[PDB]
Design a protein around this nucleic acid. Structure first.
Ligand SMILES: Nc1ncnc2c1ncn2[C@@H]1O[C@H](COP(=O)(O)OP(=O)(O)OP(O)(O)=S)[C@@H](O)[C@H]1O
Ligand SMILES: Nc1ncnc2c1ncn2[C@@H]1O[C@H](COP(=O)(O)OP(=O)(O)OP(O)(O)=S)[C@@H](O)[C@H]1O
Ligand SMILES: Nc1ncnc2c1ncn2[C@@H]1O[C@H](COP(=O)(O)OP(=O)(O)OP(O)(O)=S)[C@@H](O)[C@H]1O
Ligand SMILES: [Mg+2]
Ligand SMILES: [Mg+2]
Ligand SMILES: [Mg+2]
Lengths: 257, 257, 257, 257
DNA sequence: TTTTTTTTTTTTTTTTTTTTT
DNA sequence: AAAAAAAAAAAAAAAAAAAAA
């Protein structure tokens, strides 16, 4: 069924190139070469996690020799109230090693051992705020002992957590401020969105002012909302037998927010 | 004894089709297809929980194959000050899997494993206000890692809890409002009520204005009160040897509120 | 005495054909042909062990020459904290060989000799959890060295044991999820039960709703409870000089659970 | 019967040339010439044991002289909790000598006599982790006294055992890490597998993306799972009278994992 | 400025058995 | 007939990061 094939596609996710994503990638590349600690802070739904995923794919692990694959970048997202056994477990699994039964001290060395050999140029710890304060000692140890940069990406609240510990605050001072869209950048993003993200049989012309003012009021510059508003409107429109998104559909969806 | 058979019936509960229930079911069906996460908020005794139960029965689990049943929808109601071990336990038991002794970090993974295979297209959490703030991290993780929609049903107080966390508030921005009954919808509901819920030997004619003004003052548009006023009046009337509800009985019951 | 003859019969056990048993039987038949090693997991009192017994009798020993019997399938149930000398002893006795005095290293080899010669295409080890972890090495060796598939039937707790050893977990990934009864399948099972298991002089009509709601509340879908509730009720009823089971008897028995 | 002839074939096993197997053979060849003890560690079902078997067959025993058969490479797999009498017995039997009744101190010396004479350049001990710690002394003695290199092939758990003894850890420091398949290597392996391992009359075109995404999700890069999924699907397909594997069959089998 | 509420994270110990020699 | 080794678990508080009037 054509309709179901398009809905199964639309409900899915993809990465769209944006000025903000390229900016982060070039910035992280500098910190990687210099091995310097830094921070990534911005508002929710601005597309910070997605840009980090894209970076991991930009430079993939290289395995041209018999030895363990050389993984230049490690990306992890700690669970809630993450303790020191959990941080080490997740780093080790990411690099494809199995963790054996033992205590924190027992595989701490193993984490170091697995960290060595593989390149591990940079460690990106998304959602840094969700971590027990005691674990920031093991993060500093890694950053200090090994030639590894620790990006530590987080939301605005993270700064409230970082400032509670002098030694952490004075080691992660450099920061990039991820932001939201406004002005022409938003209009160009909507034009990009229609053509690449949407494969609808008939064009919706979402760049038009009459509907762009609606997308602007509904979105407020958050790339996460633009994705929801247009992705749901496309499925709701096709489900009615339409070949494009009607102004009435954009209004009907916007009213739910 | 005929009288006791009718009292044993009247003291029981049933689901009556209403415009508000159909409206929610069609709305949830859209969010299910789009895998969109959104809240359901309204006043107490408006019949929010009952509409959610009716939805679960609309799409029942399928057992055609010898494989584990594909449950399209999961409905749970967390206990007071629900923590992260309790949320996972209740989801797992709802899928007929028994939980073994272990830590959150052990059956957090089992939950994901039971979540995979079973369809679990949508997760409805009633009494969303009854969650420790720390648990909203495990809810976001589920909503993010897998394509599952989370309803997060709650009362007006839920909004006061949601706005305390930026990341949670942004994710659940879309909402549906239950409301209450007023005008013709109430009169038609009373007519439906006497016909479908009350089966007294002789008709009471509750639609009549002389008694409808009483039901209106006593219920103030809450389907929960209309249920109580008429269900108690029917038992109290039969217990006196009456075949119908007298105006005097409706007045006597209303005076207690 | 007629009464004692019926009680001596009722207190006994028998195998009733069910949809779950046939499903189980023909799934095992696929694994047997493919020589695949797979696990089978189910809740207590769902009739997992009985279905395995029925399978053994479906595929009986065949003797076409003076050579040892061509035993197609082996079924064993290990004792508590079963060690490697005990697993080998029980396999060997099952095939009707006497075990001589010696060490594990002596009749480990004798076990291989008698696993050979006879076909022994399948080995079903019920209650797999009750086994010392060290013995899973001898089970893998059999499964690896000989063209034999091993079932590993067990309860939910078995999965907690299996996941403690990487090499066992990976080998035994395929699974069948034995379940409980609900809906029409339960009503039809009660009709079958009264139809075949119970031969009372006068019919009880256990499929009627007034008593079926009682059997449902008392049974909760477990075939083991339906068997207890009706088997005890039949003996208790006959002992009172009744020719059928009265609603009062089903209620009296249900109250004990 | 054609169908049974194909099933009797499909249920069997064979060795498929792979990049990982050639890599190990060239690596072991270097250690053999240098007489250097070394390790082989990787995950379960990655095809570690099969590559070792292929190596033994690459360099078969040569018997062109008066002296006893010269086996350059010896391959053994110790039983569970293998002690020092068992290690010596299995080495001696492999070289085709009968072991007489006596003590460890008697055929410890007989083992040395038969290790000598025959070239015995390399000893490959599979499943090294399942060995008694006391036996590693007899392994070091062989490696130290005789010009013989010992491989010590095993899983991730072996490293936890090795690090418990300083003298063993230092001796076996060199290692080759086995890796699972990902990317193009997996797609090319599926194409190769269909051509050489499957002799089905009608081509299945398993390289196609629609079914390759299914094989990828079901396999997760483990050559052991790709073998199982496709080998069972071929038997299940032929048993239905099909000349090829249908997408429906690959899905039906994948659902069991 | 107070008063719980709980959570994991910890080892130390004490016995019991199943074979080798 | 006298020894060595490998389990295989139930204890009994306890210092403390975090939280609610
Ligand atoms: N470059 C992009 N291309 C396509 N979609 C994007 C992009 N960036 C963000 N999104 C959308 O944003 C949604 C949420 O992902 P992110 O915005 O990356 O999450 P986030 O930035 O971590 O915000 P949080 O939840 O506060 S941490 C996804 O559903 C994406 O569709
Ligand atoms: N298909 C069946 N036919 C007849 N009796 C059955 C059947 N299934 C279960 N029973 C009854 O259940 C008892 C046997 O236990 P099972 O029902 O097999 O429980 P189980 O599945 O073995 O669960 P456990 O406790 O884990 S062994 C006997 O008393 C049988 O009479
Ligand atoms: N060259 C090959 N040709 C055909 N089948 C192969 C080949 N290599 C591996 N396999 C299959 O994939 C599985 C994995 O190989 P194994 O011999 O199990 O190595 P392994 O998984 O490292 O051993 P374990 O599980 O750690 S004891 C085997 O059971 C084979 O069926
Ligand atoms: Mg995020
Ligand atoms: Mg049983
Ligand atoms: Mg192997």
């Amino acid at each position: 069924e054509w309709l179901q094939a398009e809905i199964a596609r639309l409900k899915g996710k993809s990465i769209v190139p944006l000025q903000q994503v390229k900016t982060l990638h070039d910035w992280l590349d500098g910190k990687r070469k210099a091995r310097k600690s830094c921070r990534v802070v911005g508002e929710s739904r601005t597309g910070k996690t997605v840009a980090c995923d894209a970076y991991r794919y930009r430079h993939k692990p290289q395995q041209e020799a018999g030895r363990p694959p050389t993984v230049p970048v490690v990306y992890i997202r700690p669970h809630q109230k993450c303790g020191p056994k959990d941080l080490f477990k997740k780093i080790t699994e990411y690099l494809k090693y199995r963790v054996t039964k033992g205590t924190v001290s027992d595989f701490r060395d193993r984490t170091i051992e697995v960290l060595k050999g593989c390149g591990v140029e940079m460690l990106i710890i998304d959602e840094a705020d969700r971590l027990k304060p005691e674990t920031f000692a093991d993060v500093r140890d890694i950053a200090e002992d090994l030639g590894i940069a620790v990006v530590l990406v987080g939301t605005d609240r993270l700064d409230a957590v970082i400032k509670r510990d002098e030694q952490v605050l004075e080691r992660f001072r450099a920061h990039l401020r991820f932001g939201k869209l406004s002005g022409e950048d938003f209009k160009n993003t909507v034009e990009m969105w229609e053509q690449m993200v949407l494969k609808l049989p008939v064009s919706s012309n979402l760049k038009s002012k009459e509907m762009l003012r609606i997308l602007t009021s509904a979105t407020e510059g958050y790339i996460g909302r633009l994705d929801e508003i247009l992705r749901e409107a496309a499925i709701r429109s096709l489900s009615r037998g339409l070949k494009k998104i009607d102004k009435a559909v954009l209004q009907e969806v916007a009213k739910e927010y």
